[PDB]
Write a protein that binds this ligand. Structure first.
Ligand SMILES: *[C@@H]1O[C@H](CO)[C@@H](O[C@@H]2O[C@H](CO)[C@@H](O[C@@H]3O[C@H](CO[C@H]4O[C@H](CO)[C@@H](O)[C@H](O)[C@@H]4O)[C@@H](O)[C@H](O[C@H]4O[C@H](CO)[C@@H](O)[C@H](O)[C@@H]4O)[C@@H]3O)[C@H](O)[C@H]2NC(C)=O)[C@H](O)[C@H]1NC(C)=O
Ligand SMILES: *[C@@H]1O[C@H](CO)[C@@H](O[C@@H]2O[C@H](CO)[C@@H](O[C@@H]3O[C@H](CO[C@H]4O[C@H](CO)[C@@H](O)[C@H](O)[C@@H]4O)[C@@H](O)[C@H](O[C@H]4O[C@H](CO)[C@@H](O)[C@H](O)[C@@H]4O)[C@@H]3O)[C@H](O)[C@H]2NC(C)=O)[C@H](O)[C@H]1NC(C)=O
Ligand SMILES: *[C@@H]1O[C@H](CO)[C@@H](O[C@@H]2O[C@H](CO)[C@@H](O[C@@H]3O[C@H](CO[C@H]4O[C@H](CO)[C@@H](O)[C@H](O)[C@@H]4O)[C@@H](O)[C@H](O[C@H]4O[C@H](CO)[C@@H](O)[C@H](O)[C@@H]4O)[C@@H]3O)[C@H](O)[C@H]2NC(C)=O)[C@H](O)[C@H]1NC(C)=O
Ligand SMILES: CCCCCCCC/C=C/CCCCCCCC(=O)O[C@@H](COC(=O)CCCCCCCCCCCCCCC)COP(=O)([O-])OCC[N+](C)(C)C
Ligand SMILES: CC(=O)[C@H]1CC[C@H]2[C@@H]3CC[C@H]4C[C@H](O)CC[C@]4(C)[C@H]3CC[C@]12C
Ligand SMILES: CC(=O)[C@H]1CC[C@H]2[C@@H]3CC[C@H]4C[C@H](O)CC[C@]4(C)[C@H]3CC[C@]12C
Ligand SMILES: CCCCCCCCCCCC
Ligand SMILES: CCCCCCCCCCCC
Ligand SMILES: CCCCCCCCCCCC
Ligand SMILES: CCCCCCCCCCCC
Ligand SMILES: CCCCCCCCCCCC
Ligand SMILES: CCCCCCCCCCCC
Ligand SMILES: CCCCCCCCCCCC
Ligand SMILES: CCCCCCCCCCCC
Ligand SMILES: CCCCCCCCCCCC
Ligand SMILES: CCCCCCCC
Ligand SMILES: CCCCCCCC
Ligand SMILES: CCCCCCCC
Lengths: 333, 92, 76
């Protein structure tokens, strides 16, 4: 128990007369605050809220002469509550919408004082960071979502940020398994953002997510392709069968527009036209033209050659649809 | 009773068209189109329960096979109608 | 289920009519069942509402197969 008393005396000395209101090297050079992330998971990448939920082990390391000790050789890992008695950088995520440090069992914090004065301060943070997504090529789109770590109150004359370990500062991104996304790349940037109050350091952790297209084949593309192929069946029914061909046509057209509306209602009310919208409207053109082809057939007959029109449609509709698919997929993939 | 039974019932519905006379073009046509549309909406609804996983689940394969069955039932009716040489059906 | 039975008073030589009526009735039965079950949790057993909906589905499907049987006895 003697070493316990020695460590108690050392920590009591460290916290005695400690001005939490004053940063390290106050009235001096900016304190270098290194950072390193451990991405626990990326979840809830939702375009309706234009955000993504990021769970991470956010570590910051900074020198502090006031927290330097030399009697004890080992590194003191203190109870997390001591973080309330220590100066910590006032970092924030500029695009954060709703964040929290995890609660159970205790506050998910780590404080580790090293003999040289280095403070390793870690948090387990779940942050719903805002990511404004460009859905013009959705679902065949790459989204560049960022986390903007910045010092709120301290300018570059009072604090500096750097990725501790350079490109090795952020880890665990590869092990992330998003349901409908693939994280093809991630990048770390150090900037100096200027506001009217001064110039502040900035760390930008940017993930370039790539959306997986397999699910959208199952739910979005294949049903509409099948409905178009079904609408092509009306060309194989003789022109006299008005009820059958008209029912086939209107059922296909209405189901197409219903599919488009149902899919677009889930997504946000973005004004521009997406890639899925482009494909759905293109196939709506095909099915509506099938219905209008029967309309032309009926008018031309009632109001040999009509069999010619029906036969030419019977082969040109799949060919033109296949060329539409060629152009669309070549442009977007 | 939410996906498998509806899919089996719509497949058996499409397989009712085979017992209707070939001349009833509107009836077998509405049979096929309604079964296909029901299969489409069932496929769309089934995916809504689980996440947007890229791969296909066993439910997806069962739905795909049922979709192939109903689509082929309509294609079979179209083939029958292609060789339907007369419009008027049996009488007397 | 009541309007499913009006198919029985329709003329036998009305395939486009009786078939469409039975199809609409059975598909609506399926839609009602699914809409009711969506509100409830993913409960893995049949409830009383479930068993009544299933019984009525069996009845409307039987009416549709009744027209099928009549058509196959007359034509086929
Ligand atoms: C209390 O805490 C301190 C600080 O962490 C510990 O001291 C450090 O222990 C680490 C062990 O991980 C040492 O790191 C190793 O240093 C080797 C020499 O590097 C020199 O040069 C670098 C240049 O930046 C200096 O930062 C460093 O201090 C040294 O002067 C490297 O060769 C090692 O590289 C690799 O090592 C293994 C594989 O061998 C890998 O697993 C590593 O990830 C790494 O890739 C490694 O970096 C470090 O030298 C120690 N001193 C420091 C940081 O000043 C104490 O041990 C700890 N005391 C306890 C726990 O009782
Ligand atoms: C936003 O985020 C900030 C983070 O900085 C939060 O601010 C901290 O909030 C916590 C919780 O409210 C504060 O913790 C409080 O510390 C007080 C001082 O503790 C010292 O002194 C006492 C004796 O006076 C010692 O016992 C202790 O060990 C320290 O040496 C305590 O007096 C407070 O006690 C209250 O809570 C306890 C919980 O167990 C009760 O039992 C008590 O009866 C009493 O109600 C409390 O522990 C902390 O000081 C705040 N600042 C910092 C820098 O951490 C904000 O709360 C959060 N939200 C908002 C809206 O700002
Ligand atoms: C997600 O999207 C964000 C957009 O916000 C991207 O972040 C930007 O990335 C770009 C490119 O990485 C940054 O732009 C510049 O990067 C340079 C990298 O070095 C190259 O260029 C220099 C100069 O041409 C070459 O000498 C060198 O060999 C490399 O080829 C930096 O060097 C740049 O900094 C310099 O220019 C600026 C502006 O002139 C000066 O202020 C600096 O002092 C310095 O002289 C510059 O940073 C850009 O900074 C990033 N942030 C933005 C735009 O806010 C992400 O990369 C992207 N991520 C993914 C995964 O897609
Ligand atoms: C360039 C490459 C583009 C690539 C795309 C390829 C596009 C090309 C595809 C074009 C469509 C193929 C039909 C072309 C011929 C139609 C005309 C015709 O009627 O011909 C004949 C019948 O027609 C047949 O022989 C039927 C063969 C096709 C049936 C395929 C069904 C399979 C469904 C699978 C779907 C499952 C969906 C799976 C999900 C994905 C006979 O015609 P006729 O009546 O006797 O009149 C001629 C006689 N006269 C000359 C005297 C007048
Ligand atoms: C002669 C002929 O082929 C007929 C067959 C089908 C007809 C079209 C149907 C839809 C109509 C909507 C509005 O009434 C405007 C005219 C409109 C586009 C029509 C033009 C003439 C068509 C093509
Ligand atoms: C002869 C006769 O009465 C006809 C009238 C209607 C027909 C049924 C329709 C549905 C079918 C689904 C599958 O094709 C398996 C067989 C299946 C149950 C058929 C059995 C024979 C029936 C009853
Ligand atoms: C601004 C983009 C408008 C796109 C309109 C739909 C295009 C469909 C083409 C169908 C070709 C047959
Ligand atoms: C964005 C301005 C309106 C663009 C309209 C394009 C319409 C093309 C439709 C072609 C279908 C035959
Ligand atoms: C709006 C009318 C659509 C008609 C489409 C006909 C396609 C084939 C044309 C062949 C002409 C001989
Ligand atoms: C798509 C435009 C078709 C124009 C056809 C003109 C028909 C004129 C009436 C005489 C034959 C029906
Ligand atoms: C019969 C051909 C129909 C269109 C085929 C789709 C082509 C997909 C290309 C994907 C990009 C590599
Ligand atoms: C990368 C995804 C490629 C999907 C291509 C689908 C092509 C369907 C063509 C249907 C033509 C009838
Ligand atoms: C909902 C997605 C269904 C995909 C299955 C495709 C079925 C192809 C029909 C083949 C008929 C011969
Ligand atoms: C291409 C869309 C499906 C068409 C199915 C009809 C096939 C008819 C075959 C009988 C003619 C030989
Ligand atoms: C497992 C419980 C069975 C659910 C379906 C009940 C159908 C019975 C009623 C049929 C009346 C003809
Ligand atoms: C567990 C019983 C399932 C019944 C399936 C329906 C067969 C026509
Ligand atoms: C498990 C009982 C099913 C009853 C089915 C009635 C005839 C289709
Ligand atoms: C109920 C189906 C079997 C009997 C049909 C009528 C006689 C072939």
């Amino acid at each position: 128990p003697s070493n316990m008393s020695l460590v108690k005396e050392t920590v009591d000395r460290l916290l005695k007369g400690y001005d939490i209101r004053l940063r390290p090297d106050f009235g001096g050079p900016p304190v270098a605050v290194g950072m390193n992330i451990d991405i626990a998971s990326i979840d809830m990448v939702s375009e309706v809220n234009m955000d993504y939920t990021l769970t991470m082990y956010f570590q910051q390391a900074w020198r502090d002469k006031r927290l330097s000790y030399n009697v004890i050789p080992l590194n003191l890992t203190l109870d997390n509550r001591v973080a309330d008695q220590l100066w910590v950088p006032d970092t924030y995520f500029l695009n954060d919408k709703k964040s929290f440090v995890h609660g159970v069992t205790v506050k998910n914090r780590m404080i580790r004082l090293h003999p040289d004065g280095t403070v390793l301060y870690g948090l387990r943070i779940t942050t719903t960071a805002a990511c404004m997504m460009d859905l013009r090529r959705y679902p065949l789109d790459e989204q560049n979502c960022t986390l903007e770590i910045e010092s709120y109150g301290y300018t570059t004359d009072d604090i500096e940020f750097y990725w501790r370990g350079d490109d090795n500062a952020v880890t665990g991104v590869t092990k992330i398994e998003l349901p409908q996304f693939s994280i093809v790349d991630y990048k770390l940037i150090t900037k100096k953002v200027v506001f009217s109050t001064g110039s502040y350091p900035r760390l930008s952790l940017s993930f370039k997510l790539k959306r997986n297209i397999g699910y959208f084949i199952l739910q979005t593309y294949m049903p509409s392709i099948l409905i178009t192929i079904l609408s092509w069946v009306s060309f194989w029914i003789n022109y006299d069968a008005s009820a059958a061909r008209v029912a086939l046509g209107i059922t296909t057209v209405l189901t197409m527009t219903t599919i488009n509306t149902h899919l677009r209602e889930t997504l946000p009310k973005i004004p521009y036209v997406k890639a899925i919208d482009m494909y759905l409207m293109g196939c709506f053109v095909f099915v509506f033209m099938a219905l209008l082809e029967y309309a032309l057939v009926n008018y031309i007959f009632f109001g040999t050659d009509v069999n010619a029109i029906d036969r030419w449609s019977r082969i040109f509709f799949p060919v033109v649809f296949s060329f539409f698919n060629i152009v669309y997929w070549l442009y977007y993939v | 009773i939410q996906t498998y039974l509806p899919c089996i019932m719509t497949v058996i519905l499409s397989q009712v068209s085979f017992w209707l006379n070939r001349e009833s073009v509107p009836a077998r046509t509405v049979f096929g189109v309604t079964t296909v549309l029901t299969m489409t909406t069932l496929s769309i609804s089934a995916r809504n329960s689980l996440p947007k996983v890229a791969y296909a689940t066993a439910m997806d394969w069962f739905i795909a096979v049922c979709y192939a069955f109903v689509f082929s039932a309509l294609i079979e009716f179209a083939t029958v109608n292609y060789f339907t040489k007369r419009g008027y059906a049996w009488d007397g």
